[PDB]
Amino acid sequence: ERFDSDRSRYASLGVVSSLPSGLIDSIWLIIDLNLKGVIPLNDLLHFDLLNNNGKVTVHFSQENSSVEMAIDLPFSYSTAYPSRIFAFDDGHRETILLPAEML
Amino acid sequence: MFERFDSDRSRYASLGVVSSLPSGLIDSIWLIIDLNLKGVIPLNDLLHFDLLNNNGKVTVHFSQENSSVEMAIDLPFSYSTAYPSRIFAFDDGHRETILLPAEM
Amino acid sequence: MFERFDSDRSRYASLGVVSSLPSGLIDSIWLIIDLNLKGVIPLNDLLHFDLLNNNGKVTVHFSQENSSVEMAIDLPFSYSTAYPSRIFAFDDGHRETILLPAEMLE
Amino acid sequence: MFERFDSDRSRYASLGVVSSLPSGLIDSIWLIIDLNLKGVIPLNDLLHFDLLNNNGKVTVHFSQENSSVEMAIDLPFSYSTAYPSRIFAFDDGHRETILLPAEMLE
Amino acid sequence: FERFDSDRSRYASLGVVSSLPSGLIDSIWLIIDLNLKGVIPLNDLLHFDLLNNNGKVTVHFSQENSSVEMAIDLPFSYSTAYPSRIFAFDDGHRETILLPAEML
Amino acid sequence: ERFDSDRSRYASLGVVSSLPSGLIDSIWLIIDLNLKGVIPLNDLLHFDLLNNNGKVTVHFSQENSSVEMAIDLPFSYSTAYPSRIFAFDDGHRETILLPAEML
Amino acid sequence: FERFDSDRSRYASLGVVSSLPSGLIDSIWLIIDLNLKGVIPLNDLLHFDLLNNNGKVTVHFSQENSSVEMAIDLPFSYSTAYPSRIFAFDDGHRETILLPAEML
Amino acid sequence: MFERFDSDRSRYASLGVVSSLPSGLIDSIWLIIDLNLKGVIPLNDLLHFDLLNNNGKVTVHFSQENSSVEMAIDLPFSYSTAYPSRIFAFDDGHRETILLPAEM
Structure with missing residues (x-):
């Protein structure tokens, strides 16, 4: 019911142009395969993008909760990548966007 | 009343599109709209782009519903049989989205 | 020291797969392997995935020879009848490959 | 403007071919196509090559559907009984691929 | 042969790939292919300035011995992290986007 | 009988490290598929390596003969490649080598 | 993590790839992997001089704040076309061989 | 009487080898011989190298006929099922060759 996979999902321009x-x-997969049904979720999720030895580690956290997670992914890391991104669920639409893009 | 595909508003790609292109x-x-369309032709709120194979690279055919302009842009990216034939850019006044036919 | 469907090793997709999904x-x-399988259960060097319609969305059933594990993974993506009904992930010990059953050699 | 087994377009080799030749x-x-075929005869989008033993060296017989051309090309390379007895070159109009008959889809 | 052909391969230098x-x-590249190529003759070396247009990037294009310029407003957000100029160099088989400091 | 494909064939270190x-x-293929049986051949063949629009063109020539040939190959051209190479047949062994390597 | 890991990807800059x-x-790279790595700690930046040893290349290795050097005679022919020094830089995910002029 | 694998003489790879590696x-x-073998161990006129898969990359096992030294060198290159298992370096006094078992 939150980041329900049956409602529309988007990526902002800012995310697409840099990832x-x-x-x-x-x-989306991390959320669907690791997060959803296992922890309650804020409408706003944090994903820091870390350099794991040349590859990208995603670190999931969210506010008012001390449940976090590290996920090693096979993608190459770039210093040009945003240092963190968000997943936001306004109740209709769900979107991955850059922090700067929340205003 | 709104300016179509205005760069000063939020732009998105659908999941459907992000997972095929x-x-x-x-x-x-987006760059095709900003560089070759805006300032050049008046714009429908919904744009059509066809992804064609031109010699192994992608060519985009643009058209739109209530107009007779059609434009063909050769792009550097290589083509795949699995890309959607056609995608849309849709602007609703508040949000601007690149998305799949089926997704509307 | 080496690892089954290691992500540090090259992953390819066959012609039939690449042109069809x-x-x-x-x-x-690959992410299912990486997020749900490695570190969770032991892996055969060959992995079956059935792609099923689940109300218009894709659902992947996983299984392997010599094991009692099955797993259903609901995907956000849209199902299409055009998609191949099953695929294999194969690890020949240096290179990992996803391919269609029709493309297996013997 | 496009060309049959164009060399400006990407050429891949299938898993079975790459791991076996x-x-x-x-x-x-590819060179046979480029040196002996293109510019010489019209090309089907699918090309048969038989790899034959010729006193320990490889000889490639070429042919295609809808054509009366055959060609035997003697190669400097060493024949091995391990090699696949025939392969195909296929051009799907954006990507060119060499593969084994067993790997063809339908 | 043609200056900045799309079918010849294109690279970004270390400095470039690290900061943009x-x-x-x-x-x-798309400014080149969409706006420049076919419209004016290009040098092997092309200047782009990355300017801040109210929080978004604008690209000034110029080149030595042509009075011909162009200003391209882009949709992307601006950052002072970004290099303020970049060159595009066509060495005649290989094309590269690099920082002035990375010229020879 | 000259660059006969039944005798041993080699590439010098200099060629291998740069091509x-x-x-x-x-x-070898150019020689076998285009040259041999069609023209008499010197024990020393010239192959200049030219930039054909980002790709390599081989130009074959040899001495005391005005028969030449251009062959477009699909390989990328590099300014670092030797500008020309040789095929030499001493009568036992046949070798592709750099000009500098003939001494 | 390890300085100049082999499993991290390695590039040569434009200047380098063009002249050697x-x-x-x-x-x-092989001097690094075979002679240096595992034997001495490495900096992110590594100096190689390319010297003419009677018509063949010899590589002098050094690095700032180590008195540790090494001279490696190579089988390859020398050319005055070649750059006389090159650096190897490990930026921590990407490793690169480049010309001093191409540093930042 | 000769110095084995002496760098001051001519080195070759066979056709058989050039068409598989x-x-x-x-x-x-060659670099393995010059950097890790020469000056280190006395050398047979014929050397054995095995090409092994070590985790997707090639590892070379060296041995030689009349000796009990065996050495294993991890290399950056990725491995292929179609590479020969084993190659030889053979030095005959005049020419030095890397070649295939079958080729002798």
């Missing part, structure tokens, strides 16, 4: 498609999709 | 190619639709 | 779905198979 | 032989198939 | 998002790098 | 395997093999 | 044969570029 | 990898055998 490859595969990595963006990972985020 | 590379980012580069998606960004191209 | 969108990218986001191919990556899904 | 050495590189210099795969390149040979 | 892909969409922006893609933009340079 | 990819596929391109070296091309030379 | 592959075998020589390969050599630098 | 990439140049880089072939150059590695």
